[PDB]
Amino acid sequence: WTATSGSCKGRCFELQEVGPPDCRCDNLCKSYSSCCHDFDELCLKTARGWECTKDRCGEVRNEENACHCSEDCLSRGDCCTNYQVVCKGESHWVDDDCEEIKVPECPAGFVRPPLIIFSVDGFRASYMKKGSKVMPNIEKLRSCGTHAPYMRPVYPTKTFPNLYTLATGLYPESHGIVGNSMYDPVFDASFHLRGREKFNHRWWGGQPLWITATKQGVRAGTFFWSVSIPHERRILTILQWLSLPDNERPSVYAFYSEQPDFSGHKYGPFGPEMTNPLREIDKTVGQLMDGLKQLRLHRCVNVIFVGDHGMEDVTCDRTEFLSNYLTNVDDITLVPGTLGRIRAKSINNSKYDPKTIIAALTCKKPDQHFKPYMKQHLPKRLHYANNRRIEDIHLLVDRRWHVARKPLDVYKCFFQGDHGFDNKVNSMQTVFVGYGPTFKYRTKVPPFENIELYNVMCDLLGLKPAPNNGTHGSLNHLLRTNTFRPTMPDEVSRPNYPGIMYLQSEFDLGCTCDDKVENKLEELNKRLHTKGSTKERHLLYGRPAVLYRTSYDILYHTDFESGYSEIFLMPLWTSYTISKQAEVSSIPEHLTNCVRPDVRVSPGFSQNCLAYKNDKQMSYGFLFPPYLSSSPEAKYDAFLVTNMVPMYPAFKRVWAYFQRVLVKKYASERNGVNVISGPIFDYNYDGLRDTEDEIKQYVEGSSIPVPTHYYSIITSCLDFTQPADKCDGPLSVSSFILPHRPDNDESCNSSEDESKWVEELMKMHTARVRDIEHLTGLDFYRKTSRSYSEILTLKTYLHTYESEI
Numbered sequence: 135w136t137a138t139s140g141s142c143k144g145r146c147f148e149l150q151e152v153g154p155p156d157c158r159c160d161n162l163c164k165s166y167s168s169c170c171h172d173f174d175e176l177c178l179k180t181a182r183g184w185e186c187t188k189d190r191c192g193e194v195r196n197e198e199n200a201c202h203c204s205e206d207c208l209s210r211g212d213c214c215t216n217y218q219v220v221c222k223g224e225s226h227w228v229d230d231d232c233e234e235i236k237v238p239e240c241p242a243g244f245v246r247p248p249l250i251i252f253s254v255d256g257f258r259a260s261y262m263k264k265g266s267k268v269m270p271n272i273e274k275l276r277s278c279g280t281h282a283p284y285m286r287p288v289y290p291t292k293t294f295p296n297l298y299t300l301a302t303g304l305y306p307e308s309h310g311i312v313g314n315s316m317y318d319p320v321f322d323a324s325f326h327l328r329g330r331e332k333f334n335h336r337w338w339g340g341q342p343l344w345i346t347a348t349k350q351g352v353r354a355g356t357f358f359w360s361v362s363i364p365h366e367r368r369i370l371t372i373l374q375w376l377s378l379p380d381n382e383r384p385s386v387y388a389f390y391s392e393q394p395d396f397s398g399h400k401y402g403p404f405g406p407e408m409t410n411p412l413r414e415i416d417k418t419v420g421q422l423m424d425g426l427k428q429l430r431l432h433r434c435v436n437v438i439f440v441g442d443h444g445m446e447d448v449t450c451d452r453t454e455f456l457s458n459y460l461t462n463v464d465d466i467t468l469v470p471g472t473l474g475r476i477r478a479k480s481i482n483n484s485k486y487d488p489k490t491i492i493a494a495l496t497c498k499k500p501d502q503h504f505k506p507y508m509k510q511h512l513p514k515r516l517h518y519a520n521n522r523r524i525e526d527i528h529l530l531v532d533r534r535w536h537v538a539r540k541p542l543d544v545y546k547c548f549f550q551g552d553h554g555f556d557n558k559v560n561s562m563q564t565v566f567v568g569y570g571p572t573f574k575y576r577t578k579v580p581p582f583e584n585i586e587l588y589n590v591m592c593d594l595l596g597l598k599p600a601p602n603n604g605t606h607g608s609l610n611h612l613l614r615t616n617t618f619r620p621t622m623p624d625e626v627s628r629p630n631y632p633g634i635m636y637l638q639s640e641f642d643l644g645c646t647c648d649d650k651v652e653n654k655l656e657e658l659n660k661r662l663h664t665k666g667s668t669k670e671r672h673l674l675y676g677r678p679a680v681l682y683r684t685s686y687d688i689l690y691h692t693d694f695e696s697g698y699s700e701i702f703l704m705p706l707w708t709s710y711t712i713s714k715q716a717e718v719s720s721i722p723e724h725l726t727n728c729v730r731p732d733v734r735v736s737p738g739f740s741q742n743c744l745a746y747k748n749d750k751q752m753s754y755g756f757l758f759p760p761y762l763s764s765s766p767e768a769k770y771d772a773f774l775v776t777n778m779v780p781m782y783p784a785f786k787r788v789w790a791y792f793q794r795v796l797v798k799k800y801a802s803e804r805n806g807v808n809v810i811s812g813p814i815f816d817y818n819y820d821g822l823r824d825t826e827d828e829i830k831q832y833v834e835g836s837s838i839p840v841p842t843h844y845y846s847i848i849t850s851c852l853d854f855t856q857p858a859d860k861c862d863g864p865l866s867v868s869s870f871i872l873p874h875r876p877d878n879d880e881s882c883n884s885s886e887d888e889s890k891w892v893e894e895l896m897k898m899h900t901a902r903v904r905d906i907e908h909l910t911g912l913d914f915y916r917k918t919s920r921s922y923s924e925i926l927t928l929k930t931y932l933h934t935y936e937s938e939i
């Protein structure tokens with residue numbers, strides 16, 4: 135209940151909030167039914183259209199009009215956007231040639247270039263090209279501004295998570311908005327689209343741009359707009375705010391459009407009925423740029439044209455039903471659609487077993503159009519686990535399909551488009567264009583993740599970003615002028631460089647190796663290998679930096695080089711270069727069980743084979759593969775206890791294929807590759823490395839910890855006519871984070887040869903170097919000829935393995 139006996143007289147779209155019970159006059163008031171009685175009358179005029187006609191120029195002012203064509207309207211800052219064109223014989227913004235904007239042309243009293251964020255729902259990346267013929271205003275922005283072919287959203291590819299990630303730079307798991315619909319088990323409440331619960335502040339974490347602005351003395355226009363407020367009014371409101379005196383005037387503005395998402399659901403992504411929605415966006419953009427030209431701001435303001443996600447062909451008939459897999463369907467709640475989330479219907483039931491739910495959903499039909507995971511087993515690049523609002527059980531749904539619980543939920547067909555799938559899917563990609571004095575001229579940039587923009591928008595506004603998941607500096611190549619020069623973090627732990635300190639007989643590991651067969655030329659030469667005489671062949675980008683306090687040793691060998699952790703009893707990283715000319719060999723008969731002690735590292739800081747024998751679930755593998763040894767002699771180095779890592783047999787299949795076939799293959803395709811591999815420990819699935827006392831799993835009867843994942847970073851020359859190990863120019867990279875899992879239930883073809891399923895699993899588990907840095911606490915690419923900004927961009931790249939957009 136609100137007494138709304140006040141008035142909006144003089145308060146149309148006031149910027150600060152007066153609380154209950156006094157009536158409101160802001161673009162939010164409708165959503166509370168707390169607008170003053172006269173709001174519609176005064177603040178939402180609609181009379182006489184949104185365009186000056188030839189027969190309205192120099193007219194007498196009449197306050198009841200929606201906009202004005204009167205001689206004094208320029209001053210009042212409330213002209214129609216085409217006032218100058220029709221009346222003063224000016225040309226539309228779109229119809230002028232674009233001159234480069236080498237410096238801000240801002241009128242007096244403007245201390246900084248404003249920022250307008252023009253956000254559009256469901257604007258699929260491929261609209262920029264496939265609709266270019268009917269979007270001339272936006273094609274001017276794109277071609278004269280700075281654009282990327284596409285921009286990658288976050289999972290899930292839904293509106294709320296993506297809009298709030300754009301405003302926070304945070305992953306959904308961090309900011310809290312993990313779906314359009316949500317249940318919080320601590321709150322005992324649901325977050326929905328229709329309803330008022332979504333308004334409470336307790337859902338929203340992190341610090342969005344407008345709060346970041348306000349707290350640092352930069353005033354902001356409001357971001358939310360009510361559904362009923364038409365777009366034309368929204369633009370005039372932004373143009374009026376810009377007329378406000380210097381000390382009242384916001385520096386950052388936002389506009390939003392429900393289109394083209396709204397129509398895309400009805401007609402699909404490319405239905406013929408989509409041309410019209412696109413025409414209207416362009417028209418709206420036209421009114422803004424025309425209106426800015428009127429205020430002498432068109433070479434002063436920076437404009438961001440950005441979408442939240444794309445759109446895919448989806449229909450009712452393409453629905454999987456859980457009622458055809460489970461018998462016990464009324465014992466679960468599903469959050470359905472382009473992604474599934476399952477939980478117990480009642481927490482009062484003791485016999486609710488997720489192991490058995492996943493069983494019944496795994497590879498149960500050759501058709502199957504979805505795949506269950508436990509959230510911690512999701513690809514780490516999705517960063518979709520670390521929140522109480524995300525249910526333990528998750529369904530990754532195939533592009534073009536839906537998941538529902540029972541058939542009745544789907545009839546008690548209409549739609550032809552939807553969105554929400556995995557964020558590396560082409561149809562889900564969206565747009566970025568930046569145009570203005572601070573952005574670059576006629577410049578294309580590589581695709582980037584939307585988590586990066588918060589940082590840039592803070593830069594555009596001279597703000598200091600709140601802690602976020604962007605990598606600040608990685609988008610400096612978008613900007614004409616930078617206020618952030620990124621600097622490399624300092625190494626926390628310096629290594630030990632141990633020599634030969636131990637005799638064989640001091641080791642009691644229970645490990646045998648047949649290696650007792652017997653020169654000054656080639657015996658002087660392999661000591662040199664252990665001092666690192668070939669370290670600049672196998673360690674091309676300097677040693678990783680350890681960014682935490684720990685104790686580790688650098689170990690040199692002929693073929694490879696490692697940083698060995700005395701705490702975790704295995705390498706943090708292993709580095710080696712495989713040239714194009716290198717040859718694959720096999721593990722000879724006599725060395726199949728061979729595990730040699732390392733005489734640089736004490737018995738007490740080593741693994742032992744006895745644990746592996748006694749633990750019937752856990753086998754072992756090697757980080758540097760014996761298969762790629764340079765010679766029969768060097769192959770012995772690969773069997774050192776200090777190259778050894780614990781591996782479930784099931785996972786040895788995956789790993790073996792990678793080491794035996796794929797590395798050589800990549801070395802052929804890319805003219806050699808540098809490989810760095812190591813373990814990852816993340817039992818708390820927060821995407822960050824775990825300390826010694828968070829380890830949940832050891833090899834039975836030992837202090838040998840068990841990685842939750844294994845990673846590799848594969849670098850080469852981008853100019854592939856140059857060997858990896860002699861690259862003059864920019865680098866090219868691909869990475870992965872394989873889940874270390876006791877089975878291969880994730881791959882429904884696993885009973886076949888490794889050549890059918892392994893490389894497919896690895897593609898799904900593609901990863902950014904930065905993702906690995908978070909999980910390891912290391913820092914790569916410390917010594918290159920390349921600028922640090924470029925290296926940041928390199929570390930944020932993700933190889934998607936998709937086709938061309």
Ligand SMILES: *[C@@H]1O[C@H](CO)[C@@H](O[C@@H]2O[C@H](CO)[C@@H](O[C@@H]3O[C@H](CO[C@H]4O[C@H](CO[C@H]5O[C@H](CO)[C@@H](O)[C@H](O)[C@@H]5O)[C@@H](O)[C@H](O[C@H]5O[C@H](CO)[C@@H](O)[C@H](O)[C@@H]5O[C@H]5O[C@H](CO)[C@@H](O)[C@H](O)[C@@H]5O)[C@@H]4O)[C@@H](O)[C@H](O[C@H]4O[C@H](CO)[C@@H](O)[C@H](O)[C@@H]4O[C@H]4O[C@H](CO)[C@@H](O)[C@H](O)[C@@H]4O)[C@@H]3O)[C@H](O)[C@H]2NC(C)=O)[C@H](O)[C@H]1NC(C)=O
Nearest residue numbers: 307308309310339340520521522600601602603820821908
């Ligand atoms: C992506 O980027 C983000 C952002 O950088 C990364 O996330 C950050 O990660 C940090 C490390 O995990 C984490 O630090 C915690 O913070 C704990 C308390 O923090 C509270 O305050 C936060 C700050 O808010 C303020 O923000 C601005 C400044 O930027 C200020 O101006 C304002 O005043 C703000 O208030 C606040 O964000 C945070 O809120 C979370 O919880 C709310 C609900 O309770 C949510 O609404 C909100 O969204 C946040 O939720 C996310 O984060 C929590 C983790 O806190 C997570 O569980 C949720 O799922 C969700 O994702 C807080 O209210 C602090 O207690 C922690 O310190 C403990 O650990 C240290 C370790 O050294 C100990 O030394 C210390 O003693 C302490 O231990 C205590 O706990 C032990 C057991 O738990 C116990 O035994 C012991 O005795 C102690 O009691 C630690 O510093 C940041 O909070 C987090 N920030 C954000 C925004 O999420 C993220 O890692 C990145 N991801 C990747 C993959 O890189």
Ligand SMILES: O=C(/C=C/c1ccc(OC(F)(F)F)cc1)N1CC[C@@H]2CN(C(=O)NCc3cnn[nH]3)C[C@@H]2CC1
Nearest residue numbers: 251253293297300301343357358359360388389390395
């Ligand atoms: O005006 C806004 C916000 C504007 C905004 C602009 C810029 C932003 O960020 C930054 F500038 F920082 F980048 C952030 C927010 N609203 C109103 C409409 C509702 C209803 N609504 C829907 O109907 N979605 C359609 C849908 C439903 N299912 N899939 N799609 C989704 C919801 C969005 C929020």
Ligand SMILES: [Ca+2]
Nearest residue numbers: 816822823824
């Ligand atoms: Ca962790």
Ligand SMILES: [Zn+2]
Nearest residue numbers: 255256293442
């Ligand atoms: Zn959306």
Ligand SMILES: [Zn+2]
Nearest residue numbers: 256395399553
């Ligand atoms: Zn939608």
